[PDB]
Design an enzyme around this catalytic site. Structure first.
Site, PDB file in Angstrom:
ATOM      1  N   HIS A  41       0.819  -1.235   0.000  1.00  0.00           N
ATOM      2  CA  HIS A  41       0.000   0.000   0.000  1.00  0.00           C
ATOM      3  C   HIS A  41       0.849   1.280   0.000  1.00  0.00           C
ATOM      4  CE1 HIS A  41       0.268  -0.160   4.435  1.00  0.00           C
ATOM      5  NE2 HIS A  41       0.231   1.173   4.334  1.00  0.00           N
ATOM      6  N   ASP A  85       0.231  -7.815   1.845  1.00  0.00           N
ATOM      7  CA  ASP A  85       0.643  -6.433   1.776  1.00  0.00           C
ATOM      8  C   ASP A  85       2.157  -6.395   1.794  1.00  0.00           C
ATOM      9  OD1 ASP A  85       0.638  -3.622   1.784  1.00  0.00           O
ATOM     10  OD2 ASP A  85      -0.061  -3.424   3.848  1.00  0.00           O
ATOM     11  N   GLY A 174       2.869   6.149   8.528  1.00  0.00           N
ATOM     12  CA  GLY A 174       4.225   6.547   8.146  1.00  0.00           C
ATOM     13  C   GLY A 174       5.240   5.473   8.477  1.00  0.00           C
ATOM     14  N   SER A 176       4.465   2.343   8.025  1.00  0.00           N
ATOM     15  CA  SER A 176       4.110   1.226   7.127  1.00  0.00           C
ATOM     16  C   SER A 176       5.258   0.770   6.261  1.00  0.00           C
ATOM     17  CB  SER A 176       2.894   1.553   6.270  1.00  0.00           C
ATOM     18  OG  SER A 176       1.720   1.361   7.045  1.00  0.00           O
ATOM     19  N   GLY A 177       5.382  -0.544   6.104  1.00  0.00           N
ATOM     20  CA  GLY A 177       6.470  -1.117   5.318  1.00  0.00           C
ATOM     21  C   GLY A 177       7.731  -1.295   6.130  1.00  0.00           C
TER      22      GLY A 177
HETATM   23  N1  LIG Z   1      -1.886   0.499  14.661  1.00  0.00           N
HETATM   24  C1  LIG Z   1      -1.081   0.167  13.701  1.00  0.00           C
HETATM   25  N2  LIG Z   1      -0.159  -0.798  13.897  1.00  0.00           N
HETATM   26  C2  LIG Z   1      -1.119   0.881  12.390  1.00  0.00           C
HETATM   27  C3  LIG Z   1      -2.146   1.779  12.113  1.00  0.00           C
HETATM   28  C4  LIG Z   1      -2.193   2.456  10.910  1.00  0.00           C
HETATM   29  C5  LIG Z   1      -1.183   2.289   9.968  1.00  0.00           C
HETATM   30  N3  LIG Z   1      -1.230   3.010   8.750  1.00  0.00           N
HETATM   31  C6  LIG Z   1      -2.150   3.926   8.352  1.00  0.00           C
HETATM   32  O1  LIG Z   1      -3.102   4.275   9.049  1.00  0.00           O
HETATM   33  C7  LIG Z   1      -1.919   4.552   7.009  1.00  0.00           C
HETATM   34  C8  LIG Z   1      -2.867   5.497   6.596  1.00  0.00           C
HETATM   35  C9  LIG Z   1      -2.730   6.162   5.386  1.00  0.00           C
HETATM   36  C10 LIG Z   1      -1.659   5.893   4.559  1.00  0.00           C
HETATM   37  C11 LIG Z   1      -0.698   4.972   4.940  1.00  0.00           C
HETATM   38  C12 LIG Z   1      -0.818   4.295   6.155  1.00  0.00           C
HETATM   39  O2  LIG Z   1       0.155   3.403   6.476  1.00  0.00           O
HETATM   40  C13 LIG Z   1      -0.119   1.426  10.256  1.00  0.00           C
HETATM   41  C14 LIG Z   1      -0.085   0.739  11.460  1.00  0.00           C
END
Ligand SMILES: N=C(N)c1ccc(NC(=O)c2ccccc2O)cc1
Length: 222
Positions: A41, A85, A174, A176-177
């Site tokens: 994503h 993902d 932020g 993520s990944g």
């Molecule tokens: N509680 C967690 N472990 C969690 C929650 C949200 C995200 N990510 C997002 O909400 C997100 C939203 C918009 C764009 C990219 C994202 O990663 C990643 C991890």
């Protein structure tokens, strides 16, 4: 990353910062001089990969920037459920390894007994702001049964759950990944979880990297 603290400067040489249009987008993990592993994503145009960074707000002598020449999203990736993902990014320039730039080996055994885990990233902190300095937190893998109860019918075998019963240390937007590191191996990738961020009851959900060791190897060797 919520309820964590700044990482030790020499403890995250595999951490990648992913940019699009001059803004931080996601984290990533360096797994080979030519490849970064991230979440599917995070796919955005003209991705810029920064290695060797600790503070995103300052230029650092150890940083190395690369554009991405190839983005390989898992073929069974489903945006709606965040299933599978995962994405591989081929770097335009192989990473120049250093004490601050090093690949992280993957966890190949899905039956690994370790639960001494940590997460890291430049994602949103507890105050809601984006940190300049990379954040870190120790977390534990949560049993599949407990995660299944937290997210009814949302947890596949391609996901692994982790969190912290004490402060609810968790990954956030932020991050993520970014890596979920257990026993000095890549165990998972930040994928999704509780909004607002906090893992006391609803643990964070990570891509289960051990499930992808064949697909990674076949992509890198293609
Ligand atoms: N509680 C967690 N472990 C969690 C929650 C949200 C995200 N990510 C997002 O909400 C997100 C939203 C918009 C764009 C990219 C994202 O990663 C990643 C991890």
């Amino acid at each position: 990353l919520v309820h964590g603290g700044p990482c030790d400067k020499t403890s995250h040489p595999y951490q990648a910062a992913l940019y699009t249009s001059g803004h931080l987008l996601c984290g990533g993990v360096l797994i080979h001089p030519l490849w970064v592993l991230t979440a599917a994503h995070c796919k955005k145009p003209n991705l810029q990969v920064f290695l060797g960074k600790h503070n995103l707000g300052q230029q650092e002598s150890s940083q190395e920037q690369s554009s991405v020449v190839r983005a390989v999203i898992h073929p069974d990736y489903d945006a709606a459920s965040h299933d599978q993902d995962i994405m591989l990014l081929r770097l335009a320039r192989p990473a120049k390894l250093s004490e601050l730039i090093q690949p992280l080996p993957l966890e190949r055994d899905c039956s690994a007994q370790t639960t001494s885990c940590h997460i890291l990233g430049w994602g949103k902190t507890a105050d809601g702001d984006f940190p300049d300095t990379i954040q870190c937190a120790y977390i534990h893998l949560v049993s599949r049964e407990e995660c299944e109860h937290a997210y009814p019918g949302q947890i596949t075998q391609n996901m692994l759950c982790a969190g912290d019963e004490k402060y609810g240390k968790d990954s956030c937007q932020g991050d993520s990944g970014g890596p979920l590191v257990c026993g000095d191996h890549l165990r998972g990738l930040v994928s999704w979880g509780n909004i607002p961020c906090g893992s006391k009851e609803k643990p964070g959900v990570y891509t289960n990297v051990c499930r992808y060791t064949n697909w990674i190897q076949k992509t890198i060797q293609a």
